Each structure stands twice: as structure tokens, then as C-alpha cells.
């Protein structure tokens, strides 16, 4: 099993003076950190959110981010002054940074940037570059951003070394929560007809849900999307379209790792 660690920053710039930056950090589908614009500090959302970093190593890393947030905010504002009137407020910037861990001691890091909701810029190798489809005017900010050797060196060290080391640590400290098994609970209902099988409370996310006449799997079954619950478990429903009157004989069967072979079966 491969985990993706994701630091997700969202920044809104309304005009020349108003601005807010918020971040969430994810390991797989679990939240590890929260950093609200309102807060001077980054909040742990798990007891193990510090990984295997000493208090000193953490205070130091946080301080670097604290300053980055202020730095980031002013740099965007100066960059808009360089482009104007070409580009104008309100502006949305999103960042998606982190690494994907692999078997052995292998990983892969990324730092993706989106402007007004379109993916345009990444850090690759030793420099910022625009991605295919990006507007040409971005070449000025790229050139400006790439003159900053100190930021380059830092980001390279953040992506090649810091991420993987830190995420390894999280994987150890959070093993208990990462490998938790939570049992689904299922129930049935209908609208006009259309039968609905509700599945809720399960973790992890791989789940099998099929409507069945006895032991023949109904072809018509339609799974919806995975919807989150507040307690970090999942919710899924599978609907089957039928002719009114033949609701008898049909069953909902659910397979999930937490059950340990005891499939859930429900009849209408």
C-alpha cells in the first residue's frame, strides 16, 4: 500500500490589500494538520501528527512556514503589480505539495500550483516551470521566481529530503490509525421504482456492494460516490432500478475487510 502525503494550500486575494491563506495536510485520506488563516501556528489533528521529529526540529520547521506564509502573501501581491493591468483581482492560488511513498525506501515528490483553478506551474528538478497549456504571461513570474536561488535550494531540500524523512516518521507513529478497520452498517429503502442500499461507517475505503436476486448478481446496480462521515469513515449507496411488484427476492450484499468474511446480506 502506497500513501500520498498532501499539503494543500488555498489562498484568496480579493483586492490590493485583502488576503487569506488556509491549509490542510492529508496522509492518505486522513487529516494530520490544520492551519487556519486565523492561527499563528499549525494545529495537529492527530496525536501522532508530529511524526518522529523532536520538539526542536518541529518548532524550527513551523517557524519556517510561519514566515513563508507572510512571504508568499507579499510576493503574490508584488507579482500582480508586475502583470497589471493584464491580470487583476480577485485571484485564487492553490498549492499541492508533498510526496508519495513506495515499497523499500523509494518516494516521489511534487509541488503543483494552480491559478484561478487551473494547473499552470510546478517545481521540477531545480527550478519553477510552467506546464503545457499555461498562458505565456506566466513566463515573467517564472523568470522572477527562478532568480531566487535561496528559495530554490530550500524547496529542493524540502522535496528531496524533508518530505520523505517526515512522512516515514508519520507512517510509524500513525500505524494504529492508518490500519484501523471499521465495520459498515447497511440499510434499505426505495423511491418511485428504485431500491437503495445504504452502506455507512466503514474504513478503509475499498468496499464491495452488489444487489442480488438470491445468488445472481444484478447487472443494473449503480454505485454512487464515496461520501465522508465526520468520524473519518465512509458512506456509499448502490441503487437498483426495478419494475414495481418484484421487490421480493432481491438482496443487498456487502463485502469489506472489517467483517472478516462475514458478508452483510439484507432482504427487502
Amino acid at each position: 500500500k502506497n500513501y500520498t502525503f498532501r499539503c494543500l494550500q488555498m489562498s484568496s486575494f480579493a483586492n490590493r490589500s485583502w488576503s487569506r491563506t488556509d491549509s490542510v495536510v492529508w496522509l492518505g485520506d486522513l487529516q494530520t494538520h490544520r492551519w487556519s488563516n486565523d492561527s499563528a501556528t499549525i494545529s495537529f489533528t492527530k496525536p501522532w501528527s508530529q511524526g518522529k521529529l523532536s520538539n526542536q526540529q518541529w518548532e524550527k520547521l513551523q517557524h519556517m512556514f510561519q514566515v513563508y506564509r507572510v512571504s508568499f502573501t507579499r510576493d503574490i501581491q508584488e507579482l500582480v503589480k508586475m502583470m497589471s493591468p493584464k491580470e487583476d483581482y480577485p485571484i485564487e492560488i492553490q498549492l499541492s505539495a508533498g510526496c508519495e511513498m513506495y515499497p523499500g525506501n523509494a518516494s516521489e515528490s511534487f509541488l503543483h500550483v494552480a491559478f484561478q483553478g487551473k494547473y499552470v506551474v510546478r517545481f521540477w528538478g531545480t527550478s519553477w516551470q510552467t506546464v503545457p497549456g499555461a498562458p505565456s504571461w506566466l513566463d515573467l513570474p517564472i523568470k522572477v521566481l527562478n532568480a531566487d536561488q535561496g528559495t530554490s535550494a530550500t524547496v529542493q531540500m524540502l522535496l528531496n529530503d524533508t518530505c520523505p524523512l517526515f512522512v516515514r516518521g508519520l507512517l510509524e507513529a500513525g500505524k494504529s490509525d492508518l490500519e484501523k478497520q471499521e465495520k459498515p452498517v447497511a440499510w434499505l429503502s426505495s423511491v418511485p421504482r428504485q431500491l437503495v442500499c445504504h452502506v455507512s461507517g466503514f474504513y478503509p475505503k475499498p468496499v464491495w456492494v452488489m444487489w442480488m436476486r438470491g445468488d445472481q448478481e444484478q447487472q443494473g446496480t449503480h454505485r454512487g460516490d464515496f461520501l465522508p462521515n465526520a468520524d473519518e469513515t465512509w458512506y456509499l449507496q448502490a441503487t437498483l432500478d426495478v419494475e414495481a411488484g418484484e421487490e421480493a427476492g432481491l438482496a443487498c450484499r456487502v463485502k469489506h475487510s472489517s467483517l472478516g468474511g462475514q458478508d452483510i446480506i439484507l432482504y427487502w
Partner: T-cell receptor
Framework: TQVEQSPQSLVVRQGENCVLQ??????????LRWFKQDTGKGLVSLTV?????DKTSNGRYSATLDKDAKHSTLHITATLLDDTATYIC?????????????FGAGTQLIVIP | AAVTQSPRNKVAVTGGKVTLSCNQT?????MYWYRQDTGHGLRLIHY???????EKGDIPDGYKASRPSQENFSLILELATPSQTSVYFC??????????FGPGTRLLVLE
């Protein structure tokens, strides 16, 4: 303010060495520059220090920077009369044009011939 | 890489109109105006990121800037006042961090 220099002024006999201090709170601190300004003239750059712990030299001028302490010194060896001037400390908060320079008010040096 | 300023020195009256000019041929995008008064470091008045625009620095009040072209950045004092007595420095630069300073302009504004 964010950049403090000391001493405010000093008087030195030709041939004596002296040392000028600059302490700052600027964040971040990408690089530190020392200028020399003759009375009435303009700003001649002496050196620029850019590393966490750095040392530079330029003729009879040498300089140290410590980013941990946010402290820099400028050493003049064997002062000449031409060294009579204002020495100015300037910190840049970026490694590019997105930055702002933060100027100290300077240290006034007089060399007695 | 050279920067020039004119006039180099100017006497003017309160209510008068003063224009300080800066010229730079290095093909630099960026230009900056500062004033230097004793007991203070240089302070940023106005700056410019390219031919055609101008931005407020830290002490913009009493000054208007104008960037008509890549080579020229000028600082306009519409209604000159004694407190604008000072030495003024212009600078240019590319995308890197070094600024290149002009020689300076002494301005005295008498009542």
C-alpha cells in the same frame, strides 16, 4: 527600526584598525550589503554577504555575517584618510526583485591624518 | 551598469513644481526612488516594474511618479514644501536582487 548600526560615529587615527556593527530584525534575511558614502557623493558597494555564516574581504575591508544572530561586522584594517565617510548597512529580504532593501542609518567614521 | 540623475542639485520655492529625472540604459525593468535624510536610512518613495506603471513605496505622500518609458523614471513634486528638502537617489535593476544607484540629487525648498 529593523536595522541598527553601531557605533553612531567614531574618530580614529590613520593606521588604526576599526570595526563597525550592524544588528537587524528583518525577516527573512536573504543578503546583507555594506555601502560606503563620501560626504556629498553617493553609494559605493563594498561587499555582499549571502550565506548562513559568511566571510568576505575587499582590499583592506573585511566582513562577517551571522544569520542566526542577525549580526554583521565590517572591519577596516589600517585606516587611510580616504576612509572618512558614512558606512551603511543594508539588508535584503529576498533573493530577487520581489524584495525590499532595509537601510540602516549608518556609522560616521573620521580618520585623523 | 550606469544610472544618471538630473538635475544634480536644485533650489526651489514652496508651491513650485519640481521634476527629478532618472535615466538608465541597462534595459532594466525596475526603477526606484528614495530620499535620504540624516538620522534615517534611505526610504522608498515610489517604484516601477515596467515602462507604463508606477507603485507606491513606503512614503509616497507629496510625490507623484511617472514611468513613460523603459529608460526613464521621474519623480514629480506638484506643490513643493520645505519638508521635501533632501537628497534623492534613483536606482534600477533586473529580476535579481542588486539595485544600482544613481549619484543623487540635492533639493532645497525655500519658503
Amino acid at each position: 527600526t529593523q536595522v541598527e548600526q553601531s557605533p553612531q560615529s567614531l574618530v580614529v587615527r590613520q593606521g588604526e584598525n576599526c570595526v563597525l556593527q550592524c544588528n537587524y530584525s528583518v525577516t527573512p534575511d536573504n543578503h546583507l550589503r555594506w555601502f560606503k558614502q563620501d560626504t556629498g557623493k553617493g553609494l559605493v558597494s563594498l561587499t555582499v554577504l549571502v550565506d548562513q555564516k559568511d566571510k568576505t574581504s575587499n582590499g583592506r575591508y573585511s566582513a562577517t555575517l551571522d544569520k542566526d544572530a542577525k549580526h554583521s561586522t565590517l572591519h577596516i584594517t589600517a585606516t587611510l584618510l580616504d576612509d572618512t565617510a558614512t558606512y551603511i548597512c543594508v539588508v535584503g529580504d529576498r533573493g530577487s526583485a520581489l524584495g525590499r532593501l532595509h537601510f540602516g542609518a549608518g556609522t560616521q567614521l573620521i580618520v585623523i591624518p | 551598469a550606469a544610472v544618471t540623475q538630473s538635475p544634480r542639485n536644485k533650489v526651489a520655492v514652496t508651491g513650485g513644481k519640481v521634476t527629478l529625472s532618472c535615466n538608465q540604459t541597462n534595459n532594466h525593468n525596475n526603477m526606484y526612488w528614495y530620499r535620504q535624510d540624516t538620522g534615517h536610512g534611505l526610504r522608498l518613495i515610489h517604484y516601477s516594474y515596467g515602462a507604463g506603471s508606477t507603485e507606491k513605496g513606503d512614503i509616497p505622500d507629496g510625490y507623484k511618479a511617472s514611468r513613460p518609458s523603459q529608460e526613464n523614471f521621474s519623480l514629480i513634486l506638484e506643490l513643493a514644501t520645505p519638508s521635501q528638502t533632501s537628497v534623492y537617489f534613483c536606482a534600477s535593476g533586473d529580476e535579481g536582487y542588486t539595485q544600482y544607484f544613481g549619484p543623487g540629487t540635492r533639493l532645497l525648498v525655500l519658503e
